[PDB]
Amino acid sequence: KHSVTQYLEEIPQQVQNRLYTSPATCLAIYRILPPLAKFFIMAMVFNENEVPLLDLDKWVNSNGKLQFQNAIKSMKSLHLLIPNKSSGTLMINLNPTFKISLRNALTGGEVQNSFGVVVEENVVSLDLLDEYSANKWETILHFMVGTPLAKIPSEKVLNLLKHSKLMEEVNSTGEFKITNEGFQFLLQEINSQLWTLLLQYLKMIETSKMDLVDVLHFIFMLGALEVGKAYKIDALSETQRIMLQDMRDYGLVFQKHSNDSIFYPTKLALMLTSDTKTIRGLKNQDIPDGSLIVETNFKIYSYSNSPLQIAVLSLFVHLKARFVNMVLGQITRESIRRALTNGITADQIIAYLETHAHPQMRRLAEEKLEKKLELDPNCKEPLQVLPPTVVDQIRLWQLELDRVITYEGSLYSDFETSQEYNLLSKYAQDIGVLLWKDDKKKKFFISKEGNSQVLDFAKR
Amino acid sequence: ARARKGALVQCDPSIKALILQIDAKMSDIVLEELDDTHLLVNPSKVEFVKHELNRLLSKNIYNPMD
Amino acid sequence: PADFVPDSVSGMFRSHDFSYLRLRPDHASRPLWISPSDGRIILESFSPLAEQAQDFLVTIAEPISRPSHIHEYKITAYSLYAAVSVGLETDDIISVLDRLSKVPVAESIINFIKGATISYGKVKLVIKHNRYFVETTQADILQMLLNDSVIGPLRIDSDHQVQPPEDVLEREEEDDDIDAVHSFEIANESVEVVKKRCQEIDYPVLEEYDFRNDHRNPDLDIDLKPSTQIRPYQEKSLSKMFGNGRARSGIIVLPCGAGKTLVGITAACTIKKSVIVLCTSSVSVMQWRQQFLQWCTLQPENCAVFTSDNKEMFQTESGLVVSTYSMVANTRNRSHDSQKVMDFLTGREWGFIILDEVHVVPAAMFRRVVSTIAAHAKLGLTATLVREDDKIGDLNFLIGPKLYEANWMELSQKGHIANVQCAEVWCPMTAEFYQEYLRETARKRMLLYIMNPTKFQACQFLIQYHERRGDKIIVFSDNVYALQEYALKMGKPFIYGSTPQQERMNILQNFQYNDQINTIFLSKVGDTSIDLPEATCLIQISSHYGSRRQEAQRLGRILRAKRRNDEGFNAFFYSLVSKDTQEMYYSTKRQAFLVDQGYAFKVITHLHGMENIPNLAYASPRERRELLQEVLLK
Incomplete structure (x- = not known):
């Protein structure tokens, strides 16, 4: 995930306030912040x-102050606030535009x-034009992934995908490949997919006549x-209206016909x-239409089906003969080796299966779940929740095709004494952030959380 | 604030040395060689390092699969 | 050929589509989903009659998949014959399957089920005066007997005679179906023609073996004592094979070395007629006799062992005999003792035959001796589902239908070899091994990647771990120099290449009984020439073993019954493999083979305290290269 929040904080402060002029936008981004920051903002x-910072520290107890850092770093990064070294202390307060817009929104602004x-x-019916929007979304998804016949006419959309390099396809030859x-795109189900597309439209539609404030509005x-x-009709800028027409073309707007309404x-x-329910000529069965099968035997068990969905499944498994309820496919090491040819990491697929194809694995994930979390301390053996046997097989295949091991972080030094290094290592083991350490070299390549907490403890 | 960024590489010393040879063949982009089990590289050329590694392994092993 | 291909015809009926195939209306309300085109049966948790459905499917077919949520179905011609002999109603079974299975019943599958219900394992072979005749209790059997070229044309119009039924039983049809029905007597010449017609026109007859009606054969010197060991799969297989009343010649695949010949001995005693026993080789014949037949009720005083080298009492044995394929019919006829044994075998109408692992020996000699001896009944104690002797004349219809399948998931998990865990430890690569890989592309790399000292370090960690758990360790290492070097490094009593038999037995005693020594290295010299020890922890090193079926035989034999349950995984399988070597492909082949076998498998390369083990000799890659130089000599 490009984590649009990171894009949000990317933009400078003055334009941030420009955006904060729009109270509804203020609320919508309030929806996004981590809960700690949400509560703190609502307080302020x-x-x-x-308000001084010391209180906002003493508010939070231990075992969770890491969330304190998360919130403050996020908010400072997007500069919703203004830290104030007034008397050498920290006089926190939000961007006053944010405060006034939000408060207006809460009480009739x-x-x-x-x-x-x-x-x-x-007069818009639930299915009414909802099916049309779902069909447009499916059409663009299939055309981008590449169907036998891709009727996707989004010339602007196609240009965005190509110039944005949406998928590894030869747009010069017209290829739209993964x-x-x-x-x-195969990974991010809905929020991921819609989000990547919105970011792409942002990047491509950013040169002239943008009015980014109006864009986000x-x-x-x-x-x-x-x-x-x-x-x-009314509630749109001129460029706002153009962007609205474009989005409606992109599906994300279900504008009716007549070109003026x-x-x-x-x-x-x-x-x-929302991050909620995902369900969308005139036929649409009401059920978990997603259909697939994944169990300990490493095989597809599909009774329900969906054409582009089952094609997505095929993107890492063989197809021989599509059946009525089933399609001929068996998931093996070679099946995922097909995607490993594309070099796709066996990471998104994990949570994908844990989430997608569950419309056909509800009972499977329930029997795996068994509520074996409250029962975990009593019965020490989990009952194959999120099946780790298949996880191990997938990891084995990934390593077999991988042969390389990498780690994130940065090199660390200036551990002058062994006492500080040992205490930091113990703290990291408590928080599980140390990938590896050694006092002989006083160096490692891990996340910055331990250093952050030690520095905060030292300075304040 | 001391934090040395880059493409950290960790593997067995034999493959480490092989990768160092490959990298020197492609104008030595390895930023640092932290120890016998870690290397610090610029991520820019790590991809073509992997590409050339694939090329040479295909040249040598050829995967008979007999 | 005298056998019908349908016995080994399993492996088909798995293919379908979506256009022609319509959605089963029972799919809306169907606790199971019997995929007919694929031959599958997706019996999800929604099936309330899941036990009965699984029983019916296992009878008619072979259930390939048994997942937690839903099951799977597979097609087996032998399984079809077993289902037909099961006795369930074809129409009622079809209706029940259609009701439970959401998918509609396929036309071809429905026709196959209907044919198997009546025709499959339901042929009619009448008998008059306690003999074999051409008739049937049902109407179809009588019509087939009347229209049978050998049953009818070779069958005398006389309905039945006690003396003809006893002597002539168009030969002595002791392998006929139920007697005492509308039938007519048949002559004593050409049962080969009758069975050839039955297999050619696809007539699976529910054969019996009227041993008491074998009036020509005197009751041989058989001591009918069942005091030999009896096992659940063994007794259920006996129940299946004895059929109704009189026994019958049949085919049952069994775990070799797990008391395979016990049921054969019991049946041979039961018939109380002339019987002979065959194991793989004459040396294996002696080994099997020594290992069980005296523990069994058998007294080797009558069962003379013939080799064409081991001269024994032929044509004078008062009781049953034990023979071997090599002596019975093979180029290894070093003496005319084998020829005299075959002449005596022709002379006496051996009413039953016991066979052990006939797949290795070509079926040509089997058919030759079948024609030469003109026996009454036989028995196949098979070891593999698919064998090289599945020719046009199947040895099934040469002997009998299938009755039991050596379901290793049922045997190696109930307590015999319970808790079979498999692993493939990836021994870390080193510079010298890949330098050798780049040096040569021949097959000499086997011992070159085998020798890895880290492999011995993992082995020693396994040894100490199983000593801590009080477990037993078996190691498969056909090498000589590297095996002896590892044995010297560990410094414990050890089995190795060409281990002395007395020394091997001593080490087995000190290994399964004593816990001071618990690791044995089995080479390629033993396997099919030694006694299989209890498997609790198996380690494999070499993975050549010819090309194939040697992996299956090794899996069946080396993994023997272990009556221990202290460890959560009472049967460890390990394949210490040098990672990034030539045999990575073949280790993956082994992994695929094992996952086909259904045994629990994993990989443990994150060894706990891998370098914390004692005796880190040759740990350095320099010593790895020196040992590589040593192996280059090998």
Whole structure:
């Protein structure tokens, strides 16, 4: 995940405040911050006076102060606040635009932008044009992955995928194949997929006539809630209207026909931030339509099915004959060696199977689960929750095709005494952050959490 | 604030030496060789290092699969 | 050929599509899902009659998959014959399967099931006056007997005679079906023609073996004592093979070395007629006799062992005999003792035959001696599902149908070899090994990647761990120099290449009984020439073993019954493999073979305290290279 939050903090402070002028956007990004920061912000919003940091430390007890660091580093990075070395102390307070916009949103503010929605006869049926939006999303997914016939006409969308290098396909030859980007597209189910696409549209649509403030206003207003009436009519900038038309082309806007009406709030914009239910000529069975099979025997057990979905499954397993409920496919080391040819890491697939194909493995994941977490301390043996036998086989295949071991972090030094190194190592073992250590060399290549906590302890 | 970034490489010393040879063949992009079990490299050329490693292993072993 | 291909016809009926194949309406409400085109049976947890459905499927077919959620179905011609002989109603079984299985019943599968229900294992072979005739209790059997070229044309119109049934039983049809029905007597010439017609027109007849009606054969010097050991699979196989009343010649695949010949001895005593016994080789014949037949009720006083080198009492043995394929019919006829044994075998109508591992020996000699001896019944104690002797005339229809399958998942987990865990430890690579890899591409690299000192370090850690657990360790190491070097390094009593038999027995005693020594290195000299010791921890080093089927035979034999359950995995399998070597491909082949076998498998390369083991001799890659120089001499 490119973690759009990182993109959010990427933009400078003045434009951040530009965005914070739009209260609905303020709320939508409030939805994203880690819970610690959420609570702290909600605290600060009302008492119209800065607050020293010491209190905001003593608020949080131990075993969790790491979340304290997470929150403060995030918020400082995106500069929602302004730390103030007023008297040499720390006088925290938010970007006042943020505070006023948020407080307005909570109690009937003047955010005409967030209130851009119009209430009228929303004759839009649930299935009504919802099926059309789902079909458009499926069509673009298949065309990008590459179907037998890809009717994807998103010339702008195709240009975004190509120039963005969405998938390792030869767009010069018209190929839309799975690259590392293509593999990720195969990985990020909905929020991941929609998010990567939104970021791509951002990067490509960033040169001229952007009005990024209006861009995000439009995006989140789409994600905020059903604007309905007068949306496409009134509630949009000129470039805002163009971007809205483009998004509606991209599926993410379920605008009706006639090319002039209120905003058509497709479920997709909801799907942008919901992290919830994923379900979308006129036939759509109401059930976990996802269909596949993955168990200890390393085989496909598909009774339910979905064409692009089963094709995704095939992207790492052989196909011989599609059947009525089943498709001929058996998952083996060679099956994943097919994707290893693309070099796709056996990482996204793990959580994918834990999440996707569960519409056909509900009972499987339940019997694996068995609520063996509260029962874990009593019965020390977990009952194959998130099957680790297959996990071991997959890891074995990955190593066999891998032959290389890598680690993240940075080299560390200036461990002058063995006492500090040993205490830091013990602390890291307590927190499980030390990949490897040695007092003889006083060096290692791990995450920065232990150094951060020791530095915070020393300085304050 | 001391933190030395780069493509850390950790493997067996034999493969370490082989990778050092390969890297020297491609103009020695290895930033550092921390010890017999760790190397610090610039990530820019690690990909072509892996590519040439694949090329030479295919040349030598050829995978008879007999 | 005198045998029908349908006995070994298993392996088909797995293919389908989605356009022509329609969604089974029972798929909406179907506790199981019998995939007909694939031959599968996806019996999910929604099936409430899962036990009965699994029993029916195992009867008719072979259930390949038994997952926690749903099961799997596989097609087996021998399994089809077993299901037909099961006796369940074909139409009722089809209806029950259609109800439980969500998928609709396929046309071809339904037709096969209907044919197997009546025709399969349900042929009619009448008998008059306690003999073999051309008739049937059902109407179909009588029509087939009347229209049979040998049953009818070679069968006298007389309905039945006591004397003809006893003597002539178109030969003595002791392998006929149930008697005392509408039938007519048959002559005493050409049962070969009758069985050839039955297999050619695909007539699986529910044969019996009326030993008491074998009036020509006097009751041989048989001591009918069942005091030999009896095992659950053994007794159930006996129940299947004895059929109803009189016994019958049949084929049953059994775990060799796990008391395979015990059931054969019991049946041979049961018939109380002329019987002979065959094991793989004459040396193996003696080994099997010594290891069990005196523990068994058999007295070797009558069972003369013939080799064409081991001259024994032929044509004078008062009781049953034990012979071997090499002596019976092979180029290893070093003396005319074998020829005289065959002449005596022709002279006496040996009413039954015991066979052990006939797959190695070509079926040509088997058919030659079948025609030469003109016996009453036989027996196949098979070891492999698919064998080189599955020719046009199948040895099944040459002997009899299948009755029991050596279900190793059932045997090696109930307590015999319970808790079989397998692993493939990847011995870390070193510079010298890959230098040798680049040097040459011949097959001399076997011992070159075998010798890895880290392999011995892992072996020593396993030894000390099993000593701590009080376990038993078996090692497969056919090498000589490297094996002796490792044995010197560990400094404990050890089995090795061409280990003396008395020394091997002493080490086996001190290994399975005493816990001071618990690791034995079995080479390629023993295997099919020595006594298989209890398997608790198996280590494999070499992985050549010809090309194939040697892996299967080694898995069947080296892994023997171990009545120990202290360890959570009472049967460790280990394959110490030098990683990044030539035999990585073949170690993966072994892994695939094992996962096909269904045994629990893993890989433990994160050895706990791998370098913490004592005696880190040759640990350095310099000494690895020196040992590589040593092996280059080998």
